[PDB]
Amino acid sequence: GCVXYPWC
């Protein structure tokens, strides 16, 4: 889970 997901 990258900061932004789904909009990473």
Curated annotation (Swiss-Prot):
UniProt-annotated location(s): Secreted
In-chain residues carrying the UniProt-annotated modification Cysteine amide: C8
Cellular component annotations (GO), alphabetically ordered: extracellular region
Alphabetical keyword list: Amidation, D-amino acid, Disulfide bond, Hydroxylation, Ion channel impairing toxin, Neurotoxin, Secreted, Toxin
Protein's UniProt keywords contain Disulfide bond: yes
Comment field on protein domains: The cysteine framework is C-C.
Identification of the protein by name: Contryphan-In
Organism: Conus inscriptus
